[PDB]
Amino acid sequence: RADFIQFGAMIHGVGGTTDGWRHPDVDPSASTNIEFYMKKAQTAEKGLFSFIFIADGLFISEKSIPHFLNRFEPITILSALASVTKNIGLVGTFSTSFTEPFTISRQLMSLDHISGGRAGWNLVTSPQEGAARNHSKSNLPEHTERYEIAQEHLDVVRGLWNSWEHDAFIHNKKTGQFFDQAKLHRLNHKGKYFQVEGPLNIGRSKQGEPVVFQAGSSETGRQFAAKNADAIFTHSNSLEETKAFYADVKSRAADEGRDPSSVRIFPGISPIVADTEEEAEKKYREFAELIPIENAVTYLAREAKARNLTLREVAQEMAFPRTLFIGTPERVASLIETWFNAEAADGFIVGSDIPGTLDAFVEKVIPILQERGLYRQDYRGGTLRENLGLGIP
Amino acid sequence: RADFIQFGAMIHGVGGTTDGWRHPDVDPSASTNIEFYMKKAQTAEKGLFSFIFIADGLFISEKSIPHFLNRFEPITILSALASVTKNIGLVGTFSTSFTEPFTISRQLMSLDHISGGRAGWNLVTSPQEGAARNHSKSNLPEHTERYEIAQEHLDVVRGLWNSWEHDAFIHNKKTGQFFDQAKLHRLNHKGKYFQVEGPLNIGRSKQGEPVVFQAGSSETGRQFAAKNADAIFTHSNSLEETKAFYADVKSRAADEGRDPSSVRIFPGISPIVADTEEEAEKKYREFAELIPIENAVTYLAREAKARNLTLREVAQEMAFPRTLFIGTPERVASLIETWFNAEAADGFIVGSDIPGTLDAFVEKVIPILQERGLYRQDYRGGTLRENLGLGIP
Ligand SMILES: Cc1cc2nc3c(=O)[nH]c(=O)nc-3n(C[C@H](O)[C@H](O)[C@H](O)COP(=O)(O)O)c2cc1C
Ligand SMILES: Cc1cc2nc3c(=O)[nH]c(=O)nc-3n(C[C@H](O)[C@H](O)[C@H](O)COP(=O)(O)O)c2cc1C
Ligand SMILES: OC[C@H]1O[C@H](O)[C@H](O)[C@@H](O)[C@@H]1O
Ligand SMILES: OC[C@H]1O[C@H](O)[C@H](O)[C@@H](O)[C@@H]1O
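The joint structure predicted for all components is written out below.
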């Protein structure tokens, strides 16, 4: 593989699970704790991760997971992290369903300027029906319309980001000419979902414009991403389903005129790395055991895994399934390597809900990849595009 | 006066003027320059300013002032500054006319958590008619409706901020009870302008909720501010008009049940402080002279000031009127003191467009006020409410 592998670090505060917070190692306030977020981001930056990633949602109930009940908004925390990090990209989830594209176009570009070219947007059409009810609507649009809207939203957002050319801001104190009037472009969009005259009140960043990520996994979703995205997040249920998605998407991107190396595909994994197989397994177990089994049985009570498993352990493994990427550094490194060479992945988003994981990944797994020529020895540069391998538009 | 005087620092990048950027001392890129913003904020924090202030607008044309053409968005830059500052409040201008209150309620509270209780919102109904056309509307609502909407917006925003009680987040790892279900309040707003079910997905901050500022100067505006605001910005055309406004507003606040010391009134000044009267005056002049007089005459060509002024100097003084707060430290200190004792001001927002001003104010003027018992010797605490003198709701 000509290219290197890449990593992004998802920072999800107190984690993606109903009871993982109960572990002794976990700060149950992590989700609103600036320190937690800073240390993580600096660890990822130490491991030369290309970006940190913040996921997001806009609706809760009292049965939502603890993280979702009380956490940072994405652009605030990324902007804060911007000032205490040097090269790592800053990618954040924003819905096309609720915000005005001007508002968002601005906040992302502003981030991009603050950070000297490290912004990314995880564009998300947004699934929670109750979200509508937090934003003065009755209901979400139906799924297909959702993606129609997103196309228009993005197109406006990208239009605005091109309000100014890279060299518009001339700043001639002698002539009193601040900017070149020819290099300023009014969008004048009057579309179906949005009307936006422009121009945007901030110009081009050291990487041009932020990088687009996209999560979408449906037929519609893959097409959209294949068409519009610089990078795609996907799941990692298995090597083969992930090889499939990769194939399909890189194909559809060719069908849209695009060079497929221009689209980077990033499945999400949460490695549990330890010095021995039995330590890693301990850790898995401490966490899997945190759920009250009473809960766990029920959600089970709506595969063949008679592997000497008791009902309890099967109820537990449902609550908190075990990653393939468990165990020794070389095992984890090796899977990661195999997935890459198989063309299931161009890189991975690393979750690190369990305490120590992110730190252990960076410390033990990265050096191996570096040492086998699979991962760089230092940051390519200071923008998210340089580091990702993408060209400035 | 029982209370001390207070200051906020407006940071306006390359300034509020058409040609001030042309001065040799001015970085014409200041408006998108994170370094500029950081140094300013740290200077203000060194002078124990209660807050920094970022103004904002959402519409431009090619005849807009250079700052407005290309600058940071407010919540991004405040969030960035949050991580490099320790006690100074972080106040930002946000319109009620375009954003959804959930979006904003979140971003402000998130800021509040990041900063450990230093957020403020300058609530602004927003005047630029073309702004509507950047946010998929034909036109602004008429002025009165504008303030009806703002009342609902704010009320929702404050409702959401009360989604959780200060002690809701119990975090009992032993009992598996993350939060107290009784302490979680669904807003369920179905108003005229907005419908918002809630609850907000982030809870109470170390100062409860952010502080409300408000600029409004009309009959409607004063009433609104008097009713809703923790602090009010106003102009400083003259001592007497500012005494009037102060009077009127503190009065109307009594008419709304409120203790008027609970409302803090902050006129905006841009002092030009120097070691001698003639140096300060030089500086004024270098800047006033930057405008091409050709421009300057015209805007004149639609007072009695035969003060040996040539037409040129009158055209110039229109372009860039001279502050009362020009000259020596003790003069500036003394005016500031007189305005305070006259009850025109409880504090001031300090603009510092001219290079050195903010630095000179902090260095030369503050010590005098400190030394005459008018200004504290250190920060009262770490929240914007402590420092302002306000109680947590
Ligand atoms: C790494 C990764 C991150 C995701 N982050 C979010 C998120 O932040 N917010 C959200 O609403 N959905 C998120 N999703 C879920 C997607 O919305 C989902 O996988 C899928 O694409 C559903 O959309 P579709 O029906 O259009 O394809 C994420 C998915 C992946 C795999
Ligand atoms: C210190 C100060 C800051 C202001 N900042 C803004 C601003 O950031 N954005 C804006 O649109 N108007 C701003 N204004 C202008 C107000 O909108 C204006 O003074 C006035 O209240 C007009 O509103 P009204 O007709 O409702 O009273 C500011 C005013 C003052 C005095
Ligand atoms: O809040 C709900 C959402 O937010 C999270 O951040 C998740 O990653 C996403 O899959 C979920 O839909
Ligand atoms: O952008 C236009 C607006 O933005 C500025 O930040 C100003 O303070 C405000 O008075 C003006 O209305």
